[PDB]
Amino acid sequence: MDGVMSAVTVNDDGLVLRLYIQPKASRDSIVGLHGDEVKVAITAPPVDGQANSHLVKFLGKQFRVAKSQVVIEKGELGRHKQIKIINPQQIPPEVAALINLEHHHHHH
């Protein structure tokens, strides 16, 4: 069972998220953000100067967050990159999957 570190990881007051950027795209093309590793592509290199712009913007509306919560961890020098989402707000229906967890005591 050599697999305990999933793409998504919860934390004290946030969660980690793996990534995989790919140059030459013109727009944050969401290949298939489905755990394991979220691939993406942009015409902007990993240059924290311009790369951080689109990166935050995209994941900003998607997760309804921003720099005030989005923080680049490492791996920024390539596709394999991690980001810690501090105290989010919402998420895409995709993640809404692992969110059932029936509540205690069934309501009439």
Method used for this model?
NMR
3-state secondary structure of 62: helix
Torsion over CA: 39, 49, 85, 15 (sign): positive
Q: What is the largest CA-CA distance in the chain?
A: 55
Into how many domains does the chain fold? 1
By C-alpha distance, which of 6, 35, 40 is closest to 20? Answer: 40
Q: How far, in whole angstroms, is CA 66 from its chain's centroid? A: 12
By C-alpha distance, which of 95, 97, 90, 101 is closest to 38? Answer: 95
CA distances from 73 to 14, 52, 96, 99 (A): 13, 12, 25, 26
- Residue 48: CA count within 13 A, CB half-sphere: 9
CATH code of the domain covering residue 95: 3.30.1200.10
| Parallel/antiparallel/unpaired status of strands 70-74 and 38-39 | unpaired
Residue span of the structural domain in which 47 resides: 1-108
Q: CB-based contacts of 57: which residues, under 8 Å, 6+ apart? A: none
Q: CB-based contacts of 10: which residues, under 8 Å, 6+ apart? A: none
